[PDB]
Amino acid sequence: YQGVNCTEVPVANVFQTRAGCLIGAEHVNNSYECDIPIGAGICASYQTASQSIIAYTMSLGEENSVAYSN
Amino acid sequence: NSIAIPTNFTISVTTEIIPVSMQKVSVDCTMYICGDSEECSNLLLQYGSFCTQLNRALHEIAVEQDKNTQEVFAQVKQIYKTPPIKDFGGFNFSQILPDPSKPSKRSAIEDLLFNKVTLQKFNGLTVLPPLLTDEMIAAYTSALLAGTITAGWTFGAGAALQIPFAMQMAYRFNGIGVTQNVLYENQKLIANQFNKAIGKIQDGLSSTASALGKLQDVVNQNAQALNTLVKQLSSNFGAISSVLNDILSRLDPPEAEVQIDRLINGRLQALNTYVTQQLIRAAEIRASANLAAEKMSECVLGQSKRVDFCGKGYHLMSFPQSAPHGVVFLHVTYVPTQYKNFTTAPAICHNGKAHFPREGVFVSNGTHWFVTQRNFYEPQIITTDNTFVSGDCDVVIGIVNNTVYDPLQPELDS
Amino acid sequence: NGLTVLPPLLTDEMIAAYTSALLAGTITAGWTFGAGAALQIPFAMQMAYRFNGIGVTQNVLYENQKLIANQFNKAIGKIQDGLSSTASALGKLQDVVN
Amino acid sequence: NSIAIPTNFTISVTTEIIPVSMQKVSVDCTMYICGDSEECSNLLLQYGS
Amino acid sequence: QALNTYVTQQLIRAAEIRASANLAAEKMSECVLGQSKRVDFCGKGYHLM
Ligand SMILES: *[C@@H]1O[C@H](CO)[C@@H](O[C@@H]2O[C@H](CO)[C@@H](O[C@@H]3O[C@H](CO[C@H]4O[C@H](CO)[C@@H](O)[C@H](O)[C@@H]4O)[C@@H](O)[C@H](O[C@H]4O[C@H](CO)[C@@H](O)[C@H](O)[C@@H]4O)[C@@H]3O)[C@H](O)[C@H]2NC(C)=O)[C@H](O)[C@H]1NC(C)=O
Ligand SMILES: *[C@@H]1O[C@H](CO)[C@@H](O[C@@H]2O[C@H](CO)[C@@H](O[C@@H]3O[C@H](CO[C@H]4O[C@H](CO)[C@@H](O)[C@H](O)[C@@H]4O)[C@@H](O)[C@H](O[C@H]4O[C@H](CO)[C@@H](O)[C@H](O)[C@@H]4O)[C@@H]3O)[C@H](O)[C@H]2NC(C)=O)[C@H](O)[C@H]1NC(C)=O
Ligand SMILES: *[C@@H]1O[C@H](CO)[C@@H](O[C@@H]2O[C@H](CO)[C@@H](O[C@@H]3O[C@H](CO[C@H]4O[C@H](CO)[C@@H](O)[C@H](O)[C@@H]4O)[C@@H](O)[C@H](O[C@H]4O[C@H](CO)[C@@H](O)[C@H](O)[C@@H]4O)[C@@H]3O)[C@H](O)[C@H]2NC(C)=O)[C@H](O)[C@H]1NC(C)=O
Ligand SMILES: *[C@@H]1O[C@H](CO)[C@@H](O[C@@H]2O[C@H](CO)[C@@H](O[C@@H]3O[C@H](CO[C@H]4O[C@H](CO)[C@@H](O)[C@H](O)[C@@H]4O)[C@@H](O)[C@H](O[C@H]4O[C@H](CO)[C@@H](O)[C@H](O)[C@@H]4O)[C@@H]3O)[C@H](O)[C@H]2NC(C)=O)[C@H](O)[C@H]1NC(C)=O
Ligand SMILES: *[C@@H]1O[C@H](CO)[C@@H](O[C@@H]2O[C@H](CO)[C@@H](O[C@@H]3O[C@H](CO[C@H]4O[C@H](CO)[C@@H](O)[C@H](O)[C@@H]4O)[C@@H](O)[C@H](O[C@H]4O[C@H](CO)[C@@H](O)[C@H](O)[C@@H]4O)[C@@H]3O)[C@H](O)[C@H]2NC(C)=O)[C@H](O)[C@H]1NC(C)=O
Ligand SMILES: *[C@@H]1O[C@H](CO)[C@@H](O[C@@H]2O[C@H](CO)[C@@H](O)[C@H](O)[C@H]2NC(C)=O)[C@H](O)[C@H]1NC(C)=O
Ligand SMILES: *[C@@H]1O[C@H](CO)[C@@H](O[C@@H]2O[C@H](CO)[C@@H](O)[C@H](O)[C@H]2NC(C)=O)[C@H](O)[C@H]1NC(C)=O
Ligand SMILES: *[C@@H]1O[C@H](CO)[C@@H](O[C@@H]2O[C@H](CO)[C@@H](O)[C@H](O)[C@H]2NC(C)=O)[C@H](O)[C@H]1NC(C)=O
Ligand SMILES: *[C@@H]1O[C@H](CO)[C@@H](O[C@@H]2O[C@H](CO)[C@@H](O)[C@H](O)[C@H]2NC(C)=O)[C@H](O)[C@H]1NC(C)=O
Ligand SMILES: *[C@@H]1O[C@H](CO)[C@@H](O[C@@H]2O[C@H](CO)[C@@H](O)[C@H](O)[C@H]2NC(C)=O)[C@H](O)[C@H]1NC(C)=O
Ligand SMILES: *[C@@H]1O[C@H](CO)[C@@H](O)[C@H](O)[C@H]1NC(C)=O
């Protein structure tokens, strides 16, 4: 529900994101590559554990480190 | 028979601003025309499927905006962290690298840029947020800049190791037509000029306010379009009033239908005009974004030989900085400053043969003859290692008579 | 009927002056041009320097200068005659007006 | 095991034509629709801007 | 309706002309003020002037 407040959402597994109210997805805090874009940096995907859809913040890539010298 | 050759140089830094994306807008077709009314809603179904077409067009524009941003900024998927040792041979990069002491991981110049751009729902109009937040854009830009600075010409190939910065500067000096010894003997002066130019750009941004007119124009145009669309909702269009509730509460259905029809036609025309002009403006913005992506890939990740594609002069480096709905480039160039006069010749005749320079020009300061390169004055003795031989001394127009030295005879004598 | 056409900001003489200044500066200043402190660089040296950028050595130009100049002059004259005879050269510019 | 190498050259000059700008036109909206008529002018104000 | 049609088509034509002008400016800066290594950007063959 785009641009809506869950407290209260009379027009309506409940989570308040920066893009609106999301119903039917489970929130996690592990970042991954975007699969289905929601908006404001939030992405969603379904994967194994059956019929479970999760919402996470997008990841920008694999970190790289180099040895510093002169 | 004259030629001018520079005896000095200066380092120059300029800026460039390019729009990338614009605001995303969604509109409810029936709510705009027949907001909370059933007679109007039932009359609207007689017109077919205009609302679906308008909604589809606006949705395609909204998707294209995110595609533009993704194409411009997310080019390289490796994240490089800020070097812990800020030793780059004397080059100051503090004003363009992220500030670790602030909650928003922006550089000082990005903070200056993000403070110069400034700045109806129940009519069915909604603005929805972009996919990538500003922090993500800043992170992409920072990773790109740090990787370019630290990895040199390796960068995306993987197995990256810290390449010394002065080696990169010498290698890019070589691509203009100047030998490395110039940089390795004027390093401190070059670094001083670079730092002064960066500070000058910072001050110029801190004082002037009209730098970002390119980015301000897009916002102004979009706001004006939306304001006109909203104001067209109070027109009469030949009916008795511009309120549906009034005419529903006053008149009977048989004539209310006629006047509601007039109002419906007016509102439909307004929506059509808005959508068409938005489509054209989106096409223009897409062209600008394509230019920005080409500029990034050809100037930030390599050297460009195209004239005036990366600022005025000979291109050395360029650094990106993020701006609201846009991108800013900082081009570093080489500019010769102090010229001097000499006499020149096309060829040298020594003992019945003509000599041409392998590189550079033959130059004379009144008595002696030397050979230098065109972009910096560095005379040296004319030998058989600097030149090559072709033909005799009667076809070239303007040949001289003296004189080629052999670097072997002293060795053979001893 | 309410329709008006209003003139451009730069007249044709100004456009011609800009073009002439650009061409003369390019011909006389060679690779210096906009850097300032301009001095007349001999034209044959510019031609040799641009020959070097293709993959041909300078001695070719310095030994075939007269033939090269003859071919250049003949080509310029041929273009002039072709413009003086043919009328459909500027269809690109005619289409916009039409 | 063969190769061809030129033994001569010629200088060539060609042309190219590019449009730059077009004609500038200004139109009076009310004079076109309701040229010199007050009833039409007053009816036009009902259509907004 | 007539005025609306005229204005819209003029807008599209102006966009096309602007693209052509951008090409002309790039051509001037890359072919008149320097040598170009891009194939067939400045005529057929190897570019000199
Ligand atoms: C090629 O181009 C470069 C670039 O300009 C030039 O060579 C340098 O030119 C700069 C000026 O453009 C010179 O800088 C000035 O030097 C004067 C003498 O230097 C002595 O004094 C300073 C004082 O700090 C010492 O640090 C230095 O080591 C020397 O002992 C100074 O009098 C000047 O300082 C004054 O002005 C500055 C502001 O400009 C103030 O900040 C100072 O406090 C002071 O009031 C200034 O430092 C420099 O000396 C030149 N040589 C170098 C860098 O080696 C030439 O034009 C040219 N070089 C060629 C052809 O070789
Ligand atoms: C090149 O890299 C060097 C480090 O390698 C940088 O040097 C430091 O830069 C910081 C940032 O400008 C300086 O911190 C500043 O300190 C000021 C107070 O101390 C200075 O001024 C007093 C006199 O009042 C001197 O006695 C003292 O020694 C210092 O010189 C603060 O007032 C500054 O804050 C002000 O400016 C910032 C600009 O970002 C504003 O945001 C603030 O609101 C405030 O108005 C600032 O914090 C530090 O002093 C520098 N070190 C030294 C030794 O001078 C160079 O800045 C860097 N240069 C470039 C061009 O990149
Ligand atoms: C660049 O360098 C070249 C070579 O070093 C110079 O070319 C020589 O120039 C000198 C003059 O400075 C020439 O010397 C003169 O030659 C005359 C012609 O005779 C020669 O040519 C004929 C051609 O048919 C031959 O058959 C003949 O055998 C000779 O080889 C002579 O008549 C001259 O003699 C007269 O003048 C002298 C002046 O001192 C008197 O002493 C004599 O008694 C006599 O009156 C004179 O010797 C020489 O021939 C040139 N060499 C060639 C190969 O052409 C360029 O001049 C020089 N250019 C510059 C700008 O410095
Ligand atoms: C290369 O540069 C040289 C100079 O360095 C130019 O040479 C002169 O060019 C001008 C312009 O074409 C010539 O002037 C012409 O003179 C004609 C009359 O004299 C010629 O013809 C008679 C025979 O009738 C000969 O006896 C006489 O010697 C001359 O050869 C005029 O009739 C011409 O005018 C006609 O053409 C012009 C074209 O612009 C039209 O506008 C006129 O209306 C008219 O129809 C013209 O004025 C001059 O004669 C040339 N000099 C010499 C010595 O021949 C070259 O033209 C130039 N070439 C290129 C390709 O750039
Ligand atoms: C590489 O390519 C070049 C370019 O073509 C060629 O070398 C030249 O080839 C041209 C022919 O394409 C030659 O031009 C002709 O030369 C003939 C002999 O030249 C003598 O006679 C002329 C008469 O004016 C004298 O001026 C000259 O100095 C010589 O003494 C002439 O008979 C031709 O003139 C006739 O035709 C022209 C029109 O073409 C008329 O205007 C004349 O009045 C006359 O009727 C013509 O001039 C040219 O000489 C060649 N030059 C050189 C240096 O070779 C070759 O194909 C090739 N060169 C190589 C491989 O070395
Ligand atoms: C929409 O929900 C947000 C919650 O994220 C509200 O923001 C806070 O709401 C609580 C109570 O709902 C207040 O006590 C806080 O002061 C609010 N914070 C801020 C920064 O405003 C927000 O008020 C809600 N909006 C509406 C219109 O109800
Ligand atoms: C990841 O998410 C979990 C939620 O399941 C976090 O656990 C909660 O964290 C909040 C604060 O962020 C606490 O107030 C709750 O008490 C925690 N709940 C439980 C059951 O532990 C977890 O902290 C998150 N991970 C990180 C690193 O913040
Ligand atoms: C590049 O690789 C060399 C070895 O191939 C690294 O040398 C190592 O240096 C560390 C100390 O910094 C020693 O403890 C190791 O024993 C060295 N390796 C060998 C095989 O002798 C070098 O450090 C690497 N470059 C950087 C910047 O770390
Ligand atoms: C380039 O500068 C030199 C100075 O180094 C100029 O030489 C002068 O030439 C004039 C005659 O042309 C003499 O009267 C002066 O005495 C010369 N000056 C010196 C210091 O010798 C030279 O003219 C300049 N180049 C051009 C093309 O004028
Ligand atoms: C400029 O010309 C002068 C001659 O007028 C050159 O002076 C001589 O140069 C040689 C070799 O360069 C030295 O061995 C002599 O000792 C010099 N003589 C004097 C009196 O200094 C000078 O070298 C030339 N300079 C340049 C940069 O071309
Ligand atoms: C790297 O080497 C330079 C000399 O080449 C020296 O000045 C500098 O202190 C060294 N830094 C580190 C971190 O080893």
Residue numbers in the entry:
A (entry chain B): 612 to 623, 641 to 676, 688 to 709
B (entry chain C): 710 to 828, 853 to 1147
C (entry chain A): 856 to 953
D (entry chain A): 710 to 758
E (entry chain A): 1002 to 1050
What does the paper say about this structure?
The S glycoprotein is composed of S1 and S2 subunits that mediate host-cell attachment to initiate virus-cell fusion. The S1 subunit comprises the N-terminal domain (NTD) and the receptor binding domain (RBD) with subdomains SD1 and SD2 undergoing hinge-like motions that promote RBD movement between closed and opened conformations. S2D14, which contains 20 computationally designed mutations within the S2 domain and a rationally engineered D614G mutation in the SD2 domain, has an ~11-fold increase in protein yield and retains RBD antigenicity.
Cryo–electron microscopy structures reveal a mixture of populations in various RBD conformational states. (C) The cryo-EM structure of S2D14 in the three-RBD closed conformation (2.8-Å resolution) was the minority population with 16% of total particles. Nonetheless, the PROSS mutations within S2D14 do appear to recover most of the loss in peak binding levels that may have occurred by the inclusion of the D614G mutation, which is consistent with the cryo-EM analysis showing a mix of open and closed RBD states. Analysis of the structures provides molecular details for the three main types of mutations incorporated by the evolutionary consensus design: (i) improvement of complementary electrostatic potential between interprotomer contact regions, (ii) optimization of hydrophobicity and van der Waals (VDW) contacts, and/or (iii) introduction of hydrogen bond interactions. However, as shown by DSF, the overall thermostability of S2D14 is the same as S-2P, suggesting that this loss of energy is well compensated not only by the formation of additional hydrogen bonds but also by the VDWs and electrostatic mutations that are introduced.
